[PDB]
Amino acid sequence: TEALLARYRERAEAEAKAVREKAMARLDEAVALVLKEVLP
Amino acid sequence: ESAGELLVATARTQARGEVLEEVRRRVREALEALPQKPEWPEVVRKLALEALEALPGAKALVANPEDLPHLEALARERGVELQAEPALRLGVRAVGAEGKTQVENSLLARLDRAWDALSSKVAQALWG
Amino acid sequence: MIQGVIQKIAGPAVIAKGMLGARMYDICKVGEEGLVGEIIRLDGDTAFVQVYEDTSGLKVGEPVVSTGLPLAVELGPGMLNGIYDGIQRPLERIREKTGIYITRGVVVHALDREKKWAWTPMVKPGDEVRGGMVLGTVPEFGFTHKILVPPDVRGRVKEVKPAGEYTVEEPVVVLEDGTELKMYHTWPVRRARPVQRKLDPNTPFLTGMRILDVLFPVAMGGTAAIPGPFGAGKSVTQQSLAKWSNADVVVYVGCGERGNEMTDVLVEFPELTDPKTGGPLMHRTVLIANTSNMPVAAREASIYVGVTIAEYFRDQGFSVALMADSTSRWAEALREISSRLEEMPAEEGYPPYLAARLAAFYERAGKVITLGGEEGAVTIVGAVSPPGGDMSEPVTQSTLRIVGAFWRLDASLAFRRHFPAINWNGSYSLFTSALDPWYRENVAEDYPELRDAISELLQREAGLQEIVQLVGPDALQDAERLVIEVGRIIREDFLQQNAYHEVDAYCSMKKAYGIMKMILAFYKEAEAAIKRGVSIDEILQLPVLERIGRARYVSEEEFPAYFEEAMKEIQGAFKALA
Amino acid sequence: MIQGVIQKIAGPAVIAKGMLGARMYDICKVGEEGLVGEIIRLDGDTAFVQVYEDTSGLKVGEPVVSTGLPLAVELGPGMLNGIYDGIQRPLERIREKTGIYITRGVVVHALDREKKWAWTPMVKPGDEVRGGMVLGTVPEFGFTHKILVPPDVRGRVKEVKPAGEYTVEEPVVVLEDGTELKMYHTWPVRRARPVQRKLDPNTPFLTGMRILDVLFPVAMGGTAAIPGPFGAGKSVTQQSLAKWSNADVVVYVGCGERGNEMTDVLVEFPELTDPKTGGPLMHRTVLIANTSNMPVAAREASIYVGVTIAEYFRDQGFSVALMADSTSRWAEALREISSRLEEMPAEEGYPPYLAARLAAFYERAGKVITLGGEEGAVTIVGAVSPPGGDMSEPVTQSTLRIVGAFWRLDASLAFRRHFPAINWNGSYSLFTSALDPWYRENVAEDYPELRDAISELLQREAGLQEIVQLVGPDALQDAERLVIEVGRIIREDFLQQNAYHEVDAYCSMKKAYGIMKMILAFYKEAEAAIKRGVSIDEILQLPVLERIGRARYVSEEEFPAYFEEAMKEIQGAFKALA
Amino acid sequence: DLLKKEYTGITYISGPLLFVENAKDLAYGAIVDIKDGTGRVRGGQVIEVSEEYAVIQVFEETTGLDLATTSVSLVEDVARLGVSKEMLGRRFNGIGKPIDGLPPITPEKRLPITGLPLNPVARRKPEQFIQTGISTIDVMNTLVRGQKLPIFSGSGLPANEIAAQIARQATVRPDLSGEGEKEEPFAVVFAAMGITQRELSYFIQEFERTGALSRSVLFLNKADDPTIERILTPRMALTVAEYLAFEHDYHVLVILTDMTNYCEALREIGAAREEIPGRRGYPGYMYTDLATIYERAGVVEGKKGSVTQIPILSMPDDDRTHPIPDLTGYITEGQIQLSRELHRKGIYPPIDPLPSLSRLMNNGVGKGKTREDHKQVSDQLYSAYANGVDIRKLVAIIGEDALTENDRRYLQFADAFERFFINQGQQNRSIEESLQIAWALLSMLPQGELKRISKDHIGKYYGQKLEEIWG
Numbered sequence A: 001t002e003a004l005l006a007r008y009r010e011r012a013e014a015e016a017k018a019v020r021e022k023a024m025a026r027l028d029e030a031v032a033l034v035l036k037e038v039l040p
Numbered sequence B: 001e002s003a004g005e006l007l008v009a010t011a012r013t014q015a016r017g018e019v020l021e022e023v024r025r026r027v028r029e030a031l032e033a034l035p036q037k038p039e040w041p042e043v044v045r046k047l048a049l050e051a052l053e054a055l056p057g058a059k060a061l062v063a064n065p066e067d068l069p070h071l072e073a074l075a076r077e078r079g080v081e082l083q084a085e086p087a088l089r090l091g092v093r094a095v096g097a098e099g100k101t102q103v104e105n106s107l108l109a110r111l112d113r114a115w116d117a118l119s120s121k122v123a124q125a126l127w128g
Numbered sequence C, D: 001m002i003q004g005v006i007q008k009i010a011g012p013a014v015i016a017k018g019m020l021g022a023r024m025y026d027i028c029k030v031g032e033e034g035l036v037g038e039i040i041r042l043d044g045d046t047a048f049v050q051v052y053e054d055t056s057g058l059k060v061g062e063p064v065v066s067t068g069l070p071l072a073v074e075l076g077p078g079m080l081n082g083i084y085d086g087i088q089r090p091l092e093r094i095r096e097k098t099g100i101y102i103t104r105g106v107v108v109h110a111l112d113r114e115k116k117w118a119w120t121p122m123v124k125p126g127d128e129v130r131g132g133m134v135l136g137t138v139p140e141f142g143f144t145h146k147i148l149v150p151p152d153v154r155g156r157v158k159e160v161k162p163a164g165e166y167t168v169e170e171p172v173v174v175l176e177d178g179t180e181l182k183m184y185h186t187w188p189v190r191r192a193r194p195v196q197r198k199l200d201p202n203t204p205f206l207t208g209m210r211i212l213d214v215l216f217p218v219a220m221g222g223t224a225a226i227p228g229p230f231g232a233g234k235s236v237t238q239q240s241l242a243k244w245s246n247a248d249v250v251v252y253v254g255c256g257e258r259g260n261e262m263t264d265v266l267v268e269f270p271e272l273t274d275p276k277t278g279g280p281l282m283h284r285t286v287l288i289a290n291t292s293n294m295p296v297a298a299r300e301a302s303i304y305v306g307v308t309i310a311e312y313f314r315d316q317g318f319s320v321a322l323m324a325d326s327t328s329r330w331a332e333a334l335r336e337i338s339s340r341l342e343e344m345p346a347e348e349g350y351p352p353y354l355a356a357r358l359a360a361f362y363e364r365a366g367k368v369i370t371l372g373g374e375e376g377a378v379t380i381v382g383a384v385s386p387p388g389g390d391m392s393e394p395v396t397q398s399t400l401r402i403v404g405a406f407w408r409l410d411a412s413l414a415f416r417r418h419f420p421a422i423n424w425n426g427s428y429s430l431f432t433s434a435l436d437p438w439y440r441e442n443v444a445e446d447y448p449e450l451r452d453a454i455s456e457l458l459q460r461e462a463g464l465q466e467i468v469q470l471v472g473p474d475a476l477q478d479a480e481r482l483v484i485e486v487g488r489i490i491r492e493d494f495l496q497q498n499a500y501h502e503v504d505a506y507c508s509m510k511k512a513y514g515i516m517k518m519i520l521a522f523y524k525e526a527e528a529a530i531k532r533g534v535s536i537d538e539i540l541q542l543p544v545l546e547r548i549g550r551a552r553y554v555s556e557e558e559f560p561a562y563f564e565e566a567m568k569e570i571q572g573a574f575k576a577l578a
Numbered sequence E: 001d002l003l004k005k006e007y008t009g010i011t012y013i014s015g016p017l018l019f020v021e022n023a024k025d026l027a028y029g030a031i032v033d034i035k036d037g038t039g040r041v042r043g044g045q046v047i048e049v050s051e052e053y054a055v056i057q058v059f060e061e062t063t064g065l066d067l068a069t070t071s072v073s074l075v076e077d078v079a080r081l082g083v084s085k086e087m088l089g090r091r092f093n094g095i096g097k098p099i100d101g102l103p104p105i106t107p108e109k110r111l112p113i114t115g116l117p118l119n120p121v122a123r124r125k126p127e128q129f130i131q132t133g134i135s136t137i138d139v140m141n142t143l144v145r146g147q148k149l150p151i152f153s154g155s156g157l158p159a160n161e162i163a164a165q166i167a168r169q170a171t172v173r174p175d176l177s178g179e180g181e182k183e184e185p186f187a188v189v190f191a192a193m194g195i196t197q198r199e200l201s202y203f204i205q206e207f208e209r210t211g212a213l214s215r216s217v218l219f220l221n222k223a224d225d226p227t228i229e230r231i232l233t234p235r236m237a238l239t240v241a242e243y244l245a246f247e248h249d250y251h252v253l254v255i256l257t258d259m260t261n262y263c264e265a266l267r268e269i270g271a272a273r274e275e276i277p278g279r280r281g282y283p284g285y286m287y288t289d290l291a292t293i294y295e296r297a298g299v300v301e302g303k304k305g306s307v308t309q310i311p312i313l314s315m316p317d318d319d320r321t322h323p324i325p326d327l328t329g330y331i332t333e334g335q336i337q338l339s340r341e342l343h344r345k346g347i348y349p350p351i352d353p354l355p356s357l358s359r360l361m362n363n364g365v366g367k368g369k370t371r372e373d374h375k376q377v378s379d380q381l382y383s384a385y386a387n388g389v390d391i392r393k394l395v396a397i398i399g400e401d402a403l404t405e406n407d408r409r410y411l412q413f414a415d416a417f418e419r420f421f422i423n424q425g426q427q428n429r430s431i432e433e434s435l436q437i438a439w440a441l442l443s444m445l446p447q448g449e450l451k452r453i454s455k456d457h458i459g460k461y462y463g464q465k466l467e468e469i470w471g
């Protein structure tokens, strides 16, 4: 049976979309932190 | 049965890596715009000071010709030769007294040298 | 170009000063004669050059010029049916230009620059190409020689030669980047040619010899080692593999051995017939000959050139069998070079990195998916020459740790002229279990069972032979004597194989299967007869035993009828007795 | 205090410069972290320092400071029940200070400065005192720890503190010269502590092992060596000696061996009981642990620290047992240091002074009269780890010439899981003659005769084993087969001893004497039966053989009744049959 | 730290070494980047630093380097590896770089690859019994959790198959030990030094079949890969293993598939430095170097995690006295030696118990852990098998028909032992099944000859026949 495989791949793409959406929230904050740390 | 969770783990890892790569390219683009900043002479002077104090007895200092005038006073004060090289676009390089030991303080070098240490903080800020 | 002068000469090693900027492992022209050498150590303003030619008569202060490129081989049409030296110089051209003696400093192209090739393209303008992709095909000797993009070249095709005959120097494909692609390309001998993926070998490399093809098989992508003392039969086995194997292309590397062997190949192979193509046998063979009296440093170059040529022919989709006739000579050359370098030696004077070099050489074999999407394989059979037959010497032990097959030859069998003289007790193969699915579909469904039965009989005979020798054959039981006789029959009728016999030289899998089936049937019938009171000495006088003994001399096309009649006679010799 | 800077760093070796006036074998602070080091070569303005800690991360130019003093240990109350590293650092404090990993640069006193001790003075002001005299007493774990004068201190007591609780740093005694005597003093580990006289060893070091205490005894002041290949069981025998010996104080040195052995000692010993004191076994044991992955230079330091602590406890009148878990590791550390020194090695790469170092270490043991006029002894049992079991290696050969006892281990016995696996043929002891009066007085008036009879029986069995392996055991006569079987019975029932058994782990002299007497009586009566016409095969199935075999599993307090009834059974089983 | 201190002026390149002068700021043991005129960046580590010049060992090959354009720059003063829990399903090369195509690990911590020695006080005694499913291991050479049990093998011996079988069959028996943690299966850290494509493919196929790749960390240095990376591969593998076990309570099993290649790389580095050699040219510090790898396993008090090491090495001429197996046996806690004569008989696994040993066996066996008769049965089996081997040696000279009855019984026991106890194939055997088979073999001998077993155990278990174990 491959129904569990289809469920697993749907879960994988859903988790990828969710993690991308979560990362989109603090993208500018991470950029600002990187610029602050790198600059002397 | 396990192949599905391999797929899930690989998808999550690939998405996280792509997000980190997007962060890296965005910070690179932001960092490359520093020549237009009014404080660009200040930051280039600070990094040149760091390079000079990290290399005692530097024979010469090498930087971009547009970046050259911003460091003339510091070079005169420290008594170090000042040279121009368009290849080094946004950094300061010292030749060293013997010509063998060289120190480089480019912003891109600092970025891709500290990215490994900053990855954990970036990930914890993005999700954690 | 970086250029300096000679500072020191000591054997095959030359130290050149003024070489600041020369890169490691680059090719240097040493002296006014332009001798080919390779840098192996940089120090200050000097460089340590390993000369691949004779250094006698050189003088301090002669110029040294660094070409800036590593030892590379020209890969393209024209290598087949030819013979090359250690650094890929055609010995035929050298003979035509110099005579019967090989003088140093001869400059000849690896591929003939004047021969025309029937070029026919496969790419079109605007096509996207990558490393290893096929540009077109060229007929060489019935083989379809595919012109491959160099592995590091990538771009978009702009211009293609329409058709006709062109030399290897003619640029057949020009990319939009301005790169001109010819029929040939250069590849460093020390860099393994990249592949898309490596596959598990599952097809046997049919050597044509019964013992190797049955008891200790080697897969298509496998690696085998055949060490033994002098006179054991290494060279004969290598030549039998070259003549009778099912490989598409055969690459023979005569590293530091007799020239007469190369002459024998060059004389016999053109008169022989290719077992697969049906044409001349020499048309599928490439010889890299570096005899023992040739410069010692060139042995390593010969080995690398041979393995790189084998990899290149693999990249076209062929199955290539590479034989290194003696890797111990390469080890000795490495030892001499290290001695000139004054490095700290490992055990028995060899350099400590000999194992690494052997592993790198043997790892280039295997069944792979080529960069062009085709399947190819390289089989490496490397012979070792341990001093005095001592298998504990470093070269043999280092080879044992990597190869998947170990064809150990015995001096005792060679003295008695029991050939191929493979010591079946000390030999082993790790490909036996992987090839069983192929055997069950291509030779017989019960072939593994028969092979296991034969091996078990050999083991029992070996175990009982110690008792027989220590106490006496007359003190053993009837069944034990029958086991001894069956083991002797196997040894003298199935394991033995005359390479110089016009029929026994090659033996198909079907013929060996039939022979061992007959042997097992005779063994079962003799066991049944002994269990019903029939004396063993009466059994040993049957003419069926003679028929089984001479079965191996029957030709392949005649063999099935002989096998059927011999099975019928095996049944009859004990049914008539009742 | 002499300054300096680092010039070269190469592994555990650091070369300083600007260190004029630095003395050989002084303690140095290497780097800004103050890593402990020792000067081993002076060369002009440069000093060669071996570092007792890891040198990773160090930089050229970091300061090097010489303390001006050699490696010294703090000798006083607080060493018992504790575990130390090679530099005498308490590992419990290191654990609670830095966690589960040992970080370099940790500084902590060997003796706890916080713990208070019950001072009990026994000297009075105005008394003239010499080095080695007992100033007072302090209870530690039931032991009476005597506060000794430093060996090189003379004077007259001016003031003495009253009885009470004080720390080790309190100046309990102040002399008329103004010098202050504390509860502890320092001593260079490479200088032997002086003694008034050295006595002849007349009492045995009872190890609790039948073979070691009977066939190859070691005196109380003697030295023994137990070499063998890995897996032979020298560590188990050393742990058994630590558990069961009659020594007052046991000093165990884990020189460059597995840390799990030290962990097992740390965990299991507190749950055991002292064979004489009745308290915990760990209360009499001092551990100097320098595991395999600890710095190499610390192994020699650990060996010297252990021997100095043993000598100090001897100076208080105790009988001290010192076990060096491996001296071959110390030899390997010396070899590595020499390799970093670039000096000409001796045979097998060891430095030439290895034999001198071993002799100096082994000659610090012995039964002596202390400077205070009391009696004390140190017993050294050093294990050796020859490469590949080769007893001809330099360390084992140099150990042969200085030890009084040699307990050779056999890998063949260890493979058969027969323990202690002592090779009787290759073992010897030089203390047998001197210990005879003690055996007569304390064990039995005929104990030496029984021991010699057992040794002669073993010699006869060994001298018949060649005939046994030549023609078989059945081909021998009944008397010779009886000798062989009696030797086998001895090997199985008296020499064999299970260290992990709840009862067989320890065996007193009386039990071994009883077993030997039973074996001798059985052998004599079996020989009489053989002369009487009785066959050997019914002798080998007598029920009393089970009693003989199981005698070693009988408890110590129940043994005498078992022994006397076994003697009665032995005489009956031969007299009654007639 | 943030600025690129760059060194030129290379003065000597030869083999695995590279000399750079005026490199005073390069700390000992530091990691450096070597960039040539092409722009390709190699790796390197400082092994000796002076006021005049520093000696750097090069990981990759030295092809293409020249003294005019080569440049050396500092990376970090201490060789550190970025570890994280996300490595549990990733593959890395010999120097920790990903090779599966996934993005690099985001590091939670940066631990030194050399590590630190475990404090003996902080250690706790390893006493948890691991059931490997192999009779010759479970019964006679018991492997406990946290043990160092290398496999001593030869050229053609199936060490890799045995290692894969152990990895896929290893499990604790909490029910026998009166515990109910039901701990999740072992995490596997696989380090490959000079592995061939055949063995690597076999290991990958086995791990895919058993599904253990999702919880496996792979450090693969292949035979065609640079030889100097074998110096760092075990260090990084054990750094990851220690991190996981002692910071996340994982039960880590570490497999070092070929320590002979590691010793060869060590010998090459030492010979390039003209170090004083030990036996057969190996460096004198090889014992300490191997110890710094082996002693990183074990169990720590107050922590639930554990590290179990199963190194694999090939004795060159089946030589147990070779320096590599000798040092390994001196460091590790026993060994599982493979037998070529047993292998030629078709017996798998070809483990001969006589040279095999388990030092920590007695800690994890006995009443309350596996069974009361385990140790005595093991001792009796060892004694009886040794007797059978001796009788074989005797009949090799005097003939079989001249024996007594008990000698024939011992030969029969040895034959049946080799055929049934040692030879089990790929089947997974419980400890109870192995003990039952061992008792069936011991029952072939008379009750009075079992001198090493207590009377109670004999009365409880003696009697069963071989044909009664299976149909």
Ligand SMILES: Nc1ncnc2c1ncn2[C@@H]1O[C@H](COP(=O)(O)OP(=O)(O)OP(O)(O)=S)[C@@H](O)[C@H]1O
Pocket (backbone or CB within 6 Å): C228, C229, C230, C231, C232, C233, C234, C235, C236, C237, C257, C326, C385, C419, C420, C497, C498, C499, C500
């Ligand atoms: N399979 C074979 N069948 C028949 N004759 C054989 C066979 N193998 C070897 N011989 C004979 O043995 C001789 C020696 O064989 P070679 O292969 O030349 O030995 P070799 O070991 O390869 O040579 P060297 O000295 O080791 S490089 C041949 O000339 C044949 O006469």
Ligand SMILES: Nc1ncnc2c1ncn2[C@@H]1O[C@H](COP(=O)(O)OP(=O)(O)O)[C@@H](O)[C@H]1O
Pocket (backbone or CB within 6 Å): D229, D230, D231, D232, D233, D234, D235, D236, D237, D419, D420, D497, D498, D499, D500, E357, E358, E359, E360, E362
């Ligand atoms: N007297 C003994 N009684 C029981 N077992 C022993 C004895 N001596 C050694 N052994 C066994 O020998 C094995 C290895 O012993 P060990 O001393 O640790 O090795 P080594 O001495 O070479 O360091 C262990 O399994 C241990 O149980």
Ligand SMILES: [Mg+2]
Pocket (backbone or CB within 6 Å): C234, C235, C236
């Ligand atoms: Mg030959």
Ligand SMILES: [Mg+2]
Pocket (backbone or CB within 6 Å): D234, D235, D236, D257, D258, D261
């Ligand atoms: Mg030990």
